[PDB]
Design a protein around this ligand. Structure first.
Ligand SMILES: NC(=O)c1ccc[n+]([C@@H]2O[C@H](COP(=O)([O-])OP(=O)(O)OC[C@H]3O[C@@H](n4cnc5c(N)ncnc54)[C@H](OP(=O)(O)O)[C@@H]3O)[C@@H](O)[C@H]2O)c1
Ligand SMILES: CCC1=C(C)CN(C(=O)NCCc2ccc(S(=O)(=O)NC(=O)N[C@H]3CC[C@@H](C)CC3)cc2)C1=O
Length: 315
């Protein structure tokens, strides 16, 4: 149940979301990644930013050692954080991710965001007035250093995340481009379906990968508590009854039938196991059109300095 990527590698269409907020103890990530593998998830999504690659990597090593899976059955993604965009910082950031996860390679490596930040080991560097310190970096150079990580076998595939059309084109039109991005991982759900962006990506053999596909985790630090609750949508609930499924399952299947690869985060055993049931049913053409008409251009993630920057993808 995979899609063939533009560099010849295979990406499982359903992936496990590993982020949890810092109030959740780091042992949980270990434990739920193991349950997700047990349930049948083979694609696993992490990042430097998430402070969990050690635990996610140890979960994977555990499922290999107990003979449930081999390394080559597992599709593991990490991301290059925006403090490491300068070309010389790229390979060491990747080697550092690999060392924490105790893996020899990632299956996929992404530029987490086009928005560059001040080099350092602060995740969020700020000045004396508490303002986020942005950096200016030619992203084409950052890309060339990603290409080099693929040539070196440290990343089987390389792609981007949180890019708009203009930013993709900048990579695609780069002189001497060796490797296209395999994918563009972006916020994508029935209230923000990204249809234009999706058609652009289909036209270049770039896979759109959907995050917050179930309506985000609604963390009060960066999601407006007044935003509508995706899984409480009436059209989705009505479709969950029709098919005898749940609204989350309607949300996930939507993305599969439109050719989006879809991530799903759950730290709850029963919801982890429920989510692999996306493969057990179909939506009709009409069902698909009913979900299409839910778009509200609603992004869950919002920051005081994100909606500000010269590389802000929504501007
Ligand atoms: N590239 C980027 O910038 C970026 C940004 C955001 C996210 N991501 C990635 O995308 C992943 C997923 O996105 P997300 O973290 O925003 O969460 P999500 O996949 O939209 O899920 C949101 C919530 O839905 C709940 N849930 C899951 N399955 C369910 C079901 N079957 N029924 C009812 N509720 C269900 C989960 O809560 P429970 O834990 O209570 O089950 C979860 O907190 C992340 O973990 C991360 O790996 C990447
Ligand atoms: C505005 C961007 C930014 C800084 C500047 C510093 N800083 C940061 O220190 N983080 C705090 C921890 C956190 C926040 C959200 C999530 S998240 O929303 O679950 N996961 C994601 O991967 N991506 C989010 C982060 C990247 C942006 C572009 C898209 C959404 C995971 C972890 C940021 O976030």
């Amino acid at each position: 149940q995979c899609v063939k990527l533009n560099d010849g590698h295979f990406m499982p269409v359903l992936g496990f979301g590993t982020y949890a907020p810092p109030e959740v103890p780091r042992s949980k990530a270990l434990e739920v990644t193991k349950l997700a593998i047990e349930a049948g998830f083979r694609h696993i999504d992490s990042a430097h930013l998430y402070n969990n690659e050690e635990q996610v990597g140890l979960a994977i090593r555990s499922k290999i050692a107990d003979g449930s899976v081999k390394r080559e059955d597992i599709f593991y993604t990490s991301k290059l954080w925006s403090t490491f965009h300068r070309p010389e910082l790229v390979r060491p950031a990747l080697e550092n991710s690999l060392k924490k996860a105790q893996l020899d390679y990632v299956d996929l490596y992404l530029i987490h965001s086009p928005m560059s930040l001040k080099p350092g080991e602060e995740l969020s560097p700020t000045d004396e007035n508490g303002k986020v310190i942005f950096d200016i970096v030619d992203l084409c150079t950052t890309w060339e250093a990603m290409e080099k990580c693929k040539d070196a076998g440290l990343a089987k595939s390389i792609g981007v995340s949180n890019f708009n059309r203009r930013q993709l084109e900048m990579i695609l039109n780069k002189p001497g481009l060796k490797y296209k991005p395999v994918c563009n991982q972006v916020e994508c759900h029935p209230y923000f379906n990204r249809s234009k962006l999706l058609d652009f990506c289909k036209s270049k053999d770039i896979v759109l990968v959907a995050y917050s596909a179930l309506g985000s985790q609604r963390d009060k630090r960066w999601v407006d508590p007044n935003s509508p609750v995706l899984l409480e949508d009436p059209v989705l609930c009505a479709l969950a009854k029709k098919h005898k499924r749940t609204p989350a399952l309607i949300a996930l299947r939507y993305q599969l039938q439109r050719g989006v690869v879809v991530l799903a985060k759950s730290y709850n055993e029963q919801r982890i196991r429920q989510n692999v049931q996306v493969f057990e049913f179909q939506l009709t053409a009409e069902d698909m059109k009913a979900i299409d008409g839910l778009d509200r251009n609603l992004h869950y993630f919002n920051s005081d300095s994100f909606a500000s920057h010269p590389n802000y993808p929504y501007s």
